[PDB]
Amino acid sequence: RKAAGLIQSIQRIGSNLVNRAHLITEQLTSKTVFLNMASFVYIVFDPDVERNPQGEMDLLDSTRIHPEDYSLARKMAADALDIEDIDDDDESAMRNAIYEMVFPRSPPKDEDDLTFKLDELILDDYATELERKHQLKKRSTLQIIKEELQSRYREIRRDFHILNEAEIFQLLTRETVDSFRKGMVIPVYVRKVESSYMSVSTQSLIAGNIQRQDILEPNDRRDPREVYSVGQTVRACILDVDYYNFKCQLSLLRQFTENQVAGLNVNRNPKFWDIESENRDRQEEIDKQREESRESRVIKHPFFHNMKSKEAEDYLAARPVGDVVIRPSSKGSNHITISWKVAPQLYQHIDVLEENKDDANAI
Amino acid sequence: RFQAYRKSIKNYKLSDVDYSNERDWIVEQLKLEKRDFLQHLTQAHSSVAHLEEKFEASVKKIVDFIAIESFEVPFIWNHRRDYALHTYNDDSNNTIIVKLLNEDDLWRIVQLDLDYHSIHDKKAALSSIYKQLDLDVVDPTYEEFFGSARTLSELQDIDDYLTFNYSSQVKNLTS
Amino acid sequence: KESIRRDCERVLYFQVKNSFTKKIDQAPYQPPTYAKGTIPRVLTLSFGEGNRGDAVLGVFMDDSGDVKSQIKFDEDFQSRDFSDSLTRYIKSNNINPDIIGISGFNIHTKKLFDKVNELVNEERLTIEYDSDKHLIRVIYVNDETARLYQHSSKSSAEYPNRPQLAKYCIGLAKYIQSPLLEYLALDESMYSLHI
Amino acid sequence: LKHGTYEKLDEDGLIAPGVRVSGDDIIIGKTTPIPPDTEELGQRTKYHT
Amino acid sequence: VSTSTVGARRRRAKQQVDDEENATLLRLGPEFALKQYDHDGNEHDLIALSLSESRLLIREALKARSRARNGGVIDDDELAKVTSGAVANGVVKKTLDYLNTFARFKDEETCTAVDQLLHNSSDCSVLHPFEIAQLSSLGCEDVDEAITLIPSLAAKKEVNLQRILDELNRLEDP
Amino acid sequence: MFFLKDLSLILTLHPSYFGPQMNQYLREKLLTDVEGTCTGQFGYIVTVLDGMNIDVGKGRIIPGSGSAEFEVKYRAVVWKPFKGEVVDAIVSNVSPIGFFADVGPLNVFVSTRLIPDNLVYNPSNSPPAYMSNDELITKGSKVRLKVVGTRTDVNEIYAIGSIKEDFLGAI
Amino acid sequence: LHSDDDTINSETVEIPTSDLRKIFNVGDHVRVIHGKHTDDTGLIVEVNGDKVEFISNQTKRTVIVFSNYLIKSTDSTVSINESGRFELHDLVQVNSDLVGIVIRAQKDSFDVLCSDGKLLSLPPVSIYSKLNLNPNQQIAIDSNGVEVKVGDTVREFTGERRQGTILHVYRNFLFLRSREIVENQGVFVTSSNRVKTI
Amino acid sequence: ELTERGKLQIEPESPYFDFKYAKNRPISALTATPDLYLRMIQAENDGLVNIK
RNA sequence: GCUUGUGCUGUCUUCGUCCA
């Protein structure tokens, strides 16, 4: 909100800010806000436009030096030029000295400006005398003033970042080099099938390759063309990645595609991991994967009755000797038990094995 | 940005004693958070005595700048860097500069400055409640664990202690 | 639990702040024999998705930030005609790039990058300051901000008569010229980036 | 386009006498112009007009 | 999904003010009207249920279903896990927690006495069942508090509200 | 508020299930499709009474598709909030915009504009809370609120409460 | 008219529209007629005379709009067609290394379900791009080794053993649509290794 | 410790699988890896796990 | 490295075909 108000105020006054002090003299900003923002906003200074050192514009308004240190910077510049008629209270001579130091009228051989004379100054004694007289800690401020005077508003940022192989791969594929590396298993779309090599394309268009020793199982002897076809998609395990050429090698062998399940380096330290609870939970999960579905069997036959063994015996009790009843067997849907009355309160159960069954309920 | 941070603060201008307590609290909090850095400073700069005192003075000066002078972190980092570092000359006359604080530590000091005012409000409310209790003789346990209290959890514990042991006075003022 | 949560949130906050600081702390690309921080003259190229139909669109931005001479190439980029057109375009007197930036949507961009780099190396296309001569640099450009720029209504209002891929090229060139301001132009959208 | 074949047409869009024709095959090829879509976003030789 | 026993309700032209749901005005809509019909079409009254009655009914039905599914062979978690459906399990768990943390009457005999007091009373013979459920559920302590929480009871000043509330508090286990 | 209602459901059965266990399979399908569901017209169905002895009748064969359609009538316990009703609640989450409470399966949201001003939200508190001089409401604290508005969704219900009136707030 | 007298409440009076002002009660579903918040619905919370405040349904936040821009509409029934750049159930690239599926769509926001299950609410502009994956890329392989295409119904065996029909495929993750999971309109994310084809 | 929801839904794909059966992890070392403890808390908020 | 495209008018008038 303050920025928009400042922009509107500048556009009211004339869309041009001559000097840093005009943020206070024109009532544009308050004291503390200006004190914060003075050295972080700058006004570009063109020496060809301002021929007057005593002019309204200021050299140091194009630097990072705060306005409270302008007289400090001008005293540094005046003392560096070996001037001796200078007095601290004479601001005009200070401005002339700094103007002739930063924009000399007759620069020496192969020197743009007299800023190189600043390196002869002993800033430590100046900071010591400042601390003694005025109780100001300004040792780093003298260095900042020196660096800004030698080159007004340098580029302090790091150099432009240039992408490496991993960054280029991540940029072009959106797969990091962590989620696409050796040992991982991915589905690949087969594109070419040959006698000795196979060419596939992954989901992110990275061209894969599989060799004869990695297509077929060791016990297999059939030709690769008979085993796979173009357009089919299969699972494969990564054996090498070329992050520069966007090419990878894969293997379709069972030893690589299926066994490698624990792809994460989970710290299974016994003191730091509950091994026994994990084993019990995994065993219970296998014991739940063993669950199966089952149902009764229905058979259409005049002497067939859906009864148990004891039920069949009781049913045959009311019937004379020689009558026959048929009941399902406990050994499975492929077996049938036939019970016939041998004698009063004596029955024989005979198991019959069925072969070439058309259906579980069929005969 | 300071107005946005301090918009939720009911009253920001602390008294002198409360301000000194705030400075001490921020120094203690930074000492707790920066324990490894202080250990590295003590071990690797053993030849210099009382560097932690210089660290305390620097943290207090940064808190002084932020609270009284209302300087934001970039201004302090750029134009007040001499208060955030210590220099000395070794036996071989070697000029050595030690960087006590960084920009992230200045932001953390801003965060602790913002955080302490909730503690101050809670402590003021607890002291006011104790005043309305109006004990004939000051409770040694209350003052003992109220002087050393530095987190709102301990203030909540003291509040629970007071509302339990002096429940009759609370009922009279008013389960 | 609350105390550890607050401490870990503080640590993660400072880590995210440092990561974002590493993201946005980039100067503009410095052309050779010029002082650091000087804005370079940029030429950006992209065919888009890399499909059969897609043509290459180019945008040239000078050091003053003004877009100049957007062009459309009407030939297969794997042919000699595209190479001749690009050689005539770069060697034109009114265009003097300091760097060539290339970015795209998939791995087909590698073919364009290799083609442009090989053409620049073979033809010896040097920087024209109009002495020591240096070849123009060809790089990959991170397009974090360009993909959001091309859909922004501000870009559409700025360039009403231009397609989306032209806005993508302008975003890439602006990112090369000033990464910080391009991050700032996202406004609320910069919190959705991968920091 | 239609589902029939176009390989029996000549350069001028007309079939020649003596050629075998089956149902739906194209015997006269004719096109009408259409104001192009936003395909000027870049389609080197494959933008429909 | 499920359809009520009340049907028809075709298009007309008149519009009425007794159509919006409102607890204060005792306008519960057509599907929750005072007069209902069973599967046989006979007359039926709206059946409100307090948290004690609801908790007893849900516990009884759930334990009956659990006993039936186990071949006829108390914990809320296992009883909730008896039901099928993860979202259903979460819903019944939330209801069990809500009922448990606000159970005014955890005993069958206390709930029976409360229901008999709130039904057989001469003053309560005019009280709406929703008012009865609200009084037995919210556990109010004062006539003014009950009137403020339940605006419908303000117009029924012929009810010995205070002594009924004191009897409810007495029956409530401290 | 809980109620007893006579509800009906239409159940369609594929011909592959035309076996002796048809009635029990229909019963379990009805239980899975009714228990825990939320219908805006009725509210929340929590349990079905006499769930193992529900009459299903005779199913009608749909012409042209073979599948049978069953009309199953049952009595179930149903809970539905009403506008202008005061009920108890338990706070589940605290936020600057307001607090979220749970009334059984229903989640009720109360905005700050329906909360008294003295219950200032304290985010520094552990856990964060809306606290006053004599009141402190946080996660898990008993609250008595009055339902003002109810929002009906396809298979969900959203309620809005208020605590600005008397005999409300912390309990 | 409504008044304490019953005989007055049974009378109908024809009144010009120029002397009528709408009455908005607290807790009523109202739909915005015109303005920046057009087609926003919700429940009225505060009635400050001319200005009315209401908690929205789409953004679920309080919105202050003048009473002249409100119509009492008990249901939203907002259609999101001809908006944004994203159809419902689109597989949208959130950023460089994030992807998701649009679950619900709004006038100026979207709800995205990530591959890991986290839900996000973003403006349309903040979405990086839309993934228009080719049909050959949109193929995965189940735990048995049988190919599963979009539209094939599959049912898990690990975990909760849920079932759904394939809606989108991203790497090893399958976005499934299901009837019984009403929590996210049927959309739940599982890896292809967890499912078996039916 | 795992709830039933956690007992089922904690699959290898999930980010919470890293700490599914963790134990004897000191509090002093939690601040070194804030993401781990934040993920634990977020899993707790889902009702899958309980931090004890 | 190279891959295959996915549809049709309306309204009248006249002349005819098989019965009636």
Query: B111: closest CA among B25, B40, B47?
Result: B25
Q: Are residues E15 and E28 in the same domain?
A: yes
Q: Are residues E62 and E88 in the same domain?
A: yes
SS3 string, A268-296, reads: CCCCCECHHHHHHHHHHHHHHHCCCCCCC
Q: Does G82 touch chain E (CB under 8 A)?
A: no
Q: Which two tokens stand for residue D31?
A: 């096109």
User: Residue G169 in contact with residue G91, Cβ under 8 Å?
Assistant: no
Number of domains within chain E: 2
A308 Cβ neighbours under 8 A, 6+ residues apart: A327
Find the helix packing angle between B152-165 and B103-133, rounded to 10°: 10
Sheet arrangement for strand G29-32: G62-66, G51-56, G41-48, G29-32, G70-71
Whats the size of chain E, residue-wise?
A: 174
Would you give the DSSP letter of residue A120? G
E51 CB-side CA count, 13 A: 23
Taking the CA of residue D4 and the C1' sugar atom of nucleotide I4, their distance in angstroms comes to 12
Q: Are residues F96 and F168 in the same domain?
A: yes
Taking the CA of residue D15 and the C1' sugar atom of nucleotide I5, their distance in angstroms comes to 21
Question: Is the bond into F127 cis (omega within 30 degrees of 0)?
Answer: yes
Chains in contact with C, counting 3 or more C-beta pairs less than 8 Å apart as contact: A, B, D, F, G, H
User: Residue F145 in contact with residue F86, Cβ under 8 Å?
Assistant: yes
Among left, alpha and beta (phi > 0; psi -120 to 50; other), residue F167 is left
d(CA G150, CA G139): 7
Q: Are residues F88 and F64 in the same domain?
A: no
Chains H and G touch (3+ CB pairs under 8 A): yes
Residue E57: which H helix or E strand, with range? helix E51-69
* Neighboring chain B residues of F122 at a CB cutoff of 8 Å: 118
d(CA G165, CA G171): 17
Q: Does G183 touch chain H (CB under 8 A)?
A: no
Q: Are residues F34 and F110 in the same domain?
A: no
- Which residue has 């309620």 as its token pair? F159
Helix H segments across H1-52? 4-9, 34-45
* Neighboring chain B residues of C18 at a CB cutoff of 8 Å: 104
Q: Are residues E44 and E65 in the same domain?
A: no
Burial of D32 (0-12, 13-18, 19+ CB in 10 A): exposed
- Which residue has 């301000």 as its token pair? B19
Would you give the DSSP letter of residue E158? S
CA angle A347, A349, A355 (to 5 degrees): 155
CA angle F28, F32, F38 (to 5 degrees): 145
Whole-angstrom CA distances from G64 to A262, G32, G70 are: 55, 11, 11
Whats the size of chain B, residue-wise?
A: 175
Which of the nucleotides in strand I have any atom less than 7 Å away from a protein CB atom?
1-3, 5-8
User: Residue B70 in contact with residue A32, Cβ under 8 Å?
Assistant: yes
Give the count of beta carbons closer than 10 Å to the beta carbon of residue B20: 12
Burial call A207-245: b when 16+ CB within 10 Å, e when fewer:
ebbbeeebbbeeeeeeebeeebeeeebbbbbbbebebee
Among F97, F156, F160, beta carbon nearest to G43: F160
Q: Which two tokens stand for residue G11?
A: 């009378």
Q: Which two tokens stand for residue E156?
A: 């029924």
Would you give the DSSP letter of residue D14? B
Q: Are residues E30 and E70 in the same domain?
A: no
Q: Which two tokens stand for residue B129?
A: 């409640």
Burial call C100-121: b when 16+ CB within 10 Å, e when fewer:
bbbbbbebbbbebbebbbebbe
Residue E144: which H helix or E strand, with range? helix E143-149
Chains C and G touch (3+ CB pairs under 8 A): yes
G5 CB-side CA count, 13 A: 4
d(CA G190, CA G173): 6
Q: Are residues F78 and F93 in the same domain?
A: no
Question: Considering all CA atoms of chain B, what is the largest pairwise distance in Å, rounded to the nearest integer?
Answer: 74
CA E103 to chain centre: 13
Name residue A199's beta-bridge partners.
A192, A209
d(CA C5, CA G180): 36
d(CA F71, CA F8): 7
d(CA F20, CA F40): 36
Taking the CA of residue G151 and the C1' sugar atom of nucleotide I7, their distance in angstroms comes to 27
User: Residue B107 in contact with residue B140, Cβ under 8 Å?
Assistant: no
Among B115, B153, B174, beta carbon nearest to F126: B153
Chains in contact with E, counting 3 or more C-beta pairs less than 8 Å apart as contact: F, G
| G 138-197: CB under 8 A from F | 182
Number of domains within chain F: 2
Taking the CA of residue D27 and the C1' sugar atom of nucleotide I16, their distance in angstroms comes to 29
Taking the CA of residue C64 and the C1' sugar atom of nucleotide I12, their distance in angstroms comes to 71
A65 CB-side CA count, 13 A: 28
Strand segments, DSSP code E, in chain E are: 3-4, 35-37, 43-45, 47-49
Say yes or no for a CB contact (<8 Å) between E87 and G160.
no
Among G27, G28, G62, beta carbon nearest to F111: G62
User: Residue A250 in contact with residue A200, Cβ under 8 Å?
Assistant: yes
CA distance, residue G159 to nearest chain H CA (Å): 5
d(CA C55, CA G7): 80
- Which residue has 């994310």 as its token pair? G189
Say yes or no for a CB contact (<8 Å) between C194 and G96.
yes
Q: Are residues F51 and F88 in the same domain?
A: no
What type of residue sits at position A17?
L
State the Rg of chain E over Cα.
Answer: 19
Would you give the DSSP letter of residue A15? S
- Which residue has 């770069």 as its token pair? C90
User: Residue A91 in contact with residue A71, Cβ under 8 Å?
Assistant: yes
Measured between CA atoms, the residue of chain B closest to residue C14 is B104
* Neighboring chain G residues of C151 at a CB cutoff of 8 Å: 85, 125
Give the count of beta carbons closer than 10 Å to the beta carbon of residue A41: 12
Query: H34: closest CA among C9, B164, C109?
Result: C9
Question: Considering all CA atoms of chain H, what is the largest pairwise distance in Å, rounded to the nearest integer?
Answer: 31
User: Residue A294 in contact with residue A333, Cβ under 8 Å?
Assistant: no
Whats the size of chain D, residue-wise?
A: 49
Q: Give residue E14's domain range.
A: 1-48
Give the count of beta carbons closer than 10 Å to the beta carbon of residue F141: 19
Taking the CA of residue D2 and the C1' sugar atom of nucleotide I12, their distance in angstroms comes to 30
B29 Cβ neighbours under 8 A, 6+ residues apart: B112
Query: A113: closest CA among A125, A103, A122?
Result: A103
Q: Which two tokens stand for residue B37?
A: 């850095």
Among A264, A271, A278, beta carbon nearest to H21: A278
User: Residue E53 in contact with residue E21, Cβ under 8 Å?
Assistant: no
Whole-angstrom CA distances from F74 to A21, A356, B122 are: 86, 48, 58
Say yes or no for a CB contact (<8 Å) between F155 and G182.
yes
* Neighboring chain G residues of E85 at a CB cutoff of 8 Å: 180
d(CA B108, CA B73): 10
A335 CB-side CA count, 13 A: 8
- Determine which of A261, A264, A273 to mutate to test the interface with H (most H C-beta atoms within 10 Å): A273
**Three-state secondary-structure class, residue A47:** coil
Would you give the DSSP letter of residue G112? E
CA B24 to chain centre: 5
Query: B120: closest CA among B140, B150, B147, B143?
Result: B150
Q: What is the DSSP string of B110-144?
A: HHHHHHHHHHHHHHHHHHHHHHHH--SS--HHHHH
- Which residue has 């019990």 as its token pair? A280
Q: Which two tokens stand for residue G37?
A: 């918040």
Taking the CA of residue G91 and the C1' sugar atom of nucleotide I9, their distance in angstroms comes to 40
CATH number at residue E70: 1.20.1250.40
CA B158 to chain centre: 20
Say yes or no for a CB contact (<8 Å) between B152 and F125.
yes
Q: What is the DSSP string of G139-197?
A: EEE-TTS-EEETT-EEEESSTT--EEEEEEEETTEEEEE-SS-TTTTTEEEEEGGGEEE
Q: Which two tokens stand for residue E59?
A: 């516990």
Q: Does E1 touch chain G (CB under 8 A)?
A: no
Q: Are residues E19 and E67 in the same domain?
A: no
Whats the size of chain F, residue-wise?
A: 171
User: Residue C145 in contact with residue C134, Cβ under 8 Å?
Assistant: no
Say yes or no for a CB contact (<8 Å) between A273 and H21.
yes
Last residue of a domain, one of F61, F82, F103: F82
Q: Are residues F89 and F137 in the same domain?
A: yes
Q: Are residues E92 and E43 in the same domain?
A: no
Name residue E43's beta-bridge partners.
E37
Q: Which two tokens stand for residue E30?
A: 């057509």
Q: Which two tokens stand for residue A345?
A: 């309160």
Q: What is the DSSP string of F45-93?
A: EEEETTTTS-----PEEPTTT--EEEEEEEEEEEE---TTEEEEEEEEE
Q: Are residues F48 and F100 in the same domain?
A: no
Residue G122: which H helix or E strand, with range? strand G119-122
CA distance, residue B149 to nearest chain C CA (Å): 16
C179 Cβ neighbours under 8 A, 6+ residues apart: C24, C26, C28, C145
CATH number at residue F143: 2.40.50.140
Q: Does G159 touch chain H (CB under 8 A)?
A: yes
Say yes or no for a CB contact (<8 Å) between E87 and G183.
yes
What type of residue sits at position C195?
I
Would you give the DSSP letter of residue B15? -
d(CA B174, CA B171): 5
Q: Are residues F67 and F95 in the same domain?
A: no
In degrees rounded to 5, what are phi and psi of residue G174?
A: -115, 125
Helix H segments across chain A? 2-13, 22-25, 31-37, 70-80, 91-102, 123-134, 139-150, 165-173, 212-215, 224-227, 254-257, 275-289, 309-317
d(CA C178, CA G184): 42
d(CA A12, CA A22): 13
Whole-angstrom CA distances from A160 to C134, C183, E29 are: 18, 15, 70
Q: Are residues F47 and F128 in the same domain?
A: no
Last residue of a domain, one of F82, F103, F133: F82
Give the count of beta carbons closer than 10 Å to the beta carbon of residue C145: 23
User: Residue F139 in contact with residue F171, Cβ under 8 Å?
Assistant: no
Chains E and G touch (3+ CB pairs under 8 A): yes
d(CA E157, CA C43): 88
CA angle A213, A219, A220 (to 5 degrees): 70
Helix, strand and coil in chain E, % to nearest 5: 50, 5, 40
Find the helix packing angle between B35-44 and B16-33, rounded to 10°: 70
What type of residue sits at position F136?
L
Q: Are residues E142 and E168 in the same domain?
A: yes
Q: Are residues E143 and E169 in the same domain?
A: yes
What type of residue sits at position C9?
E
Give the count of beta carbons closer than 10 Å to the beta carbon of residue F56: 19
Q: Are residues F87 and F73 in the same domain?
A: no
Residue F13: which H helix or E strand, with range? strand F2-13
User: Residue G1 in contact with residue G16, Cβ under 8 Å?
Assistant: no
Q: Give residue F63's domain range.
A: 1-82
d(CA F88, CA G123): 37
User: Residue C171 in contact with residue C143, Cβ under 8 Å?
Assistant: yes
Nucleotide nearest to A192 (CA to C1'): I1
Query: G192: closest CA among G148, G150, G128, G142?
Result: G142
Q: Are residues E172 and E97 in the same domain?
A: yes
Query: F4: closest CA among E19, E109, E38?
Result: E38
Taking the CA of residue D24 and the C1' sugar atom of nucleotide I20, their distance in angstroms comes to 39
SS3 string, B44-89, reads: HCCCCCCHHHHHHHHHHHHHHHHHHHCCCHHHHHHHCHHHHEEEEE
Q: Are residues E162 and E147 in the same domain?
A: yes
d(CA F19, CA B27): 80
Q: Are residues E33 and E54 in the same domain?
A: no
In degrees rounded to 5, what are phi and psi of residue G85?
A: -140, 20
**Three-state secondary-structure class, residue G12:** coil
Would you give the DSSP letter of residue E85? -
d(CA A21, CA A57): 10
A51 Cβ neighbours under 8 A, 6+ residues apart: none
Pairing, β A335-343 against β G62-66: unpaired
Q: Does G125 touch chain E (CB under 8 A)?
A: no
Give the count of beta carbons closer than 10 Å to the beta carbon of residue B60: 16
Q: Are residues E103 and E161 in the same domain?
A: yes
Among F3, F33, F36, beta carbon nearest to E47: F3
User: Residue B45 in contact with residue B98, Cβ under 8 Å?
Assistant: yes
Query: F138: closest CA among F81, F83, F93?
Result: F93
Q: Which two tokens stand for residue B137?
A: 């003789």
Q: Are residues F2 and F77 in the same domain?
A: yes
Q: Are residues F54 and F104 in the same domain?
A: no
Say yes or no for a CB contact (<8 Å) between G116 and H11.
no
d(CA A269, CA G58): 48
Say yes or no for a CB contact (<8 Å) between F114 and G43.
no
Nucleotide nearest to D2 (CA to C1'): I7
Residues with CB under 7 A from strand I: A 191-192, 207; C 52; D 1-3, 24
d(CA C116, CA A257): 40
Query: C73: closest CA among C52, C91, C89, C60?
Result: C89
CA G122 to chain centre: 12
Query: C193: closest CA among C143, C154, C153?
Result: C143
In degrees rounded to 5, what are phi and psi of residue A212?
A: -55, -45
**Three-state secondary-structure class, residue D31:** coil
Q: Does H15 touch chain G (CB under 8 A)?
A: yes
CA A138 to chain centre: 44
C53 Cβ neighbours under 8 A, 6+ residues apart: D43, D44, D46, D47
d(CA E16, CA C110): 72
d(CA A258, CA A235): 9
Query: C128: closest CA among C94, C104, C105, C101?
Result: C94
- Which residue has 């700094």 as its token pair? A98
Sheet arrangement for strand G119-122: G119-122, G110-114, G98-105, G91-95, G129-130
Whole-angstrom CA distances from F170 to A331, E11, F137, G81, G83 are: 67, 47, 6, 45, 45
Q: Which two tokens stand for residue G141?
A: 């392989």
User: Residue G182 in contact with residue E87, Cβ under 8 Å?
Assistant: yes
d(CA E134, CA F81): 12
Last residue of a domain, one of F56, F82, F108: F82
